Design a binder for this molecule. Structure first.
Ligand SMILES: O=C(O)CCC(=O)C(=O)O
Ligand code: NA
Ligand code: NI
Length: 356
């Protein structure tokens, strides 16, 4: 791939668009550019598996055992796989093939959507902020998917039709599965939705977004990271690993644990806002995605978050003498999102900043 492309991809100033790593990987460089070098914990028992059919079983003994398993996973792990989840195999196959198809399109075709200033949705990691900034070894496509009025209509119109139709179907199925899980988590926590401002009501008309992740092979995989360590900010994340390449890791007791998605599974995790709503009973866990020297990895994360005007705090029935209130109450989700963006990166986590 030509000398001009190398120059366009590597001669970067602050304020320029973050370049495509899928394009950079075509150069097959010996050494990665300095911006991709990180500047840690050892490697490690595997994440629990929750069966959705068992969870929804009309047989109370089956349902109760699976509820106990869900409750355990949310408390002790913050991450679990879901199987027998009711999302049609043919839909999942289409999500995989259409997203694979999409990233294999040319840059021109992937960036057809024209962003007005402050429109950050669609393809792209954003802009280079400083020489200090570390870039992830990944390209993304990220957009809001619910409610309907948060969809960028021109972005959706410029997607390939089968991808768009598949994404719209997948949005609905992800939303349904998220509500199955929120409803059972409510039941596990013994929150009566009628008497109490609970959990499910916050999410039923909440926001949904998708982040499609493309992690190209990297010649120096022990210097770079696919996706920098983070906890997800919102409610429930439902992740599909698109191909059979491993890379997701979670931070457990000061060590990184690999997650290997089962063939017909999604990986589900608790976000920071859900930790707050549960008064710290369920845990939002730090995780990252690592790259490798030989194979690209793809994934799609679907985030299920409160409405922007939802008032956030620990659910009052989870505040007890045995579990006193750990977190502040009373900010809207949208204000927490904004405050976190303009927060100090030096010092504490978002969660630790919300502690009473
Ligand atoms: O690609 C992965 O396995 C992880 C994705 C992720 O953590 C995210 O999109 O928040
Ligand atoms: Na209480
Ligand atoms: Ni994540």
């Amino acid at each position: 791939s030509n000398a001009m492309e190398k120059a366009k991809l590597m001669k970067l100033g602050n304020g320029m668009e973050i370049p495509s790593v899928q394009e950079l990987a075509k150069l097959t460089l010996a050494e990665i550019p300095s911006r991709y070098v990180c500047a840690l914990l050892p490697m490690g028992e595997t994440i629990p598996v929750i069966d959705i059919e068992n969870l929804l079983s009309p047989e109370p003994i089956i349902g109760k055992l699976e509820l106990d398993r869900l409750h355990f996973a949310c408390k002790e792990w913050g991450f679990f796989q879901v199987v027998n989840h009711g999302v049609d195999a043919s839909l999942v196959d289409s999500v995989k093939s259409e997203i694979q198809g999409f990233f294999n399109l040319s840059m021109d075709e992937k960036t057809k959507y024209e962003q007005e200033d402050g429109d950050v949705e669609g393809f792209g990691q954003g802009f280079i902020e400083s020489e200090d900034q570390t870039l992830d070894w990944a390209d993304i496509f990220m957009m809001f998917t619910l409610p309907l009025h948060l969809r960028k209509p021109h972005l959706f119109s410029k997607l390939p039709v089968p991808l768009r139709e598949t994404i719209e179907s997948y949005s609905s199925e992800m939303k349904k599965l998220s509500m199955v899980l929120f409803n059972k988590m409510e039941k596990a926590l013994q929150v009566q939705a009628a008497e109490i401002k609970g959990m499910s009501e916050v999410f039923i008309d909440g926001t949904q977004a998708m982040r499609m992740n493309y992690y190209p092979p990297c010649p120096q995989p022990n210097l770079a990271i696919g996706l920098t360590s983070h906890s997800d900010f919102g409610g429930l994340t439902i992740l599909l690993q698109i191909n059979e390449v491993e890379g997701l890791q979670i931070k457990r007791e000061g060590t990184w644990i690999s997650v290997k998605p089962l063939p017909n599974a999604f990986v589900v995790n608790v976000g920071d806002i859900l930790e707050i709503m549960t008064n710290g009973i369920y845990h939002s866990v730090d995780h990252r995605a690592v790259v490798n020297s030989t194979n690209e990895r793809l994934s799609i994360a679907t985030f299920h978050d409160p409405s922007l005007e939802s008032v956030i705090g620990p659910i009052s029935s989870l505040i007890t003498p045995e579990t006193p209130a750990l977190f502040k109450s009373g900010s809207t989700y949208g204000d927490l999102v904004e405050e976190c963006k303009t927060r100090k990166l030096d010092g504490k986590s978002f969660l630790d900043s919300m502690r009473i």
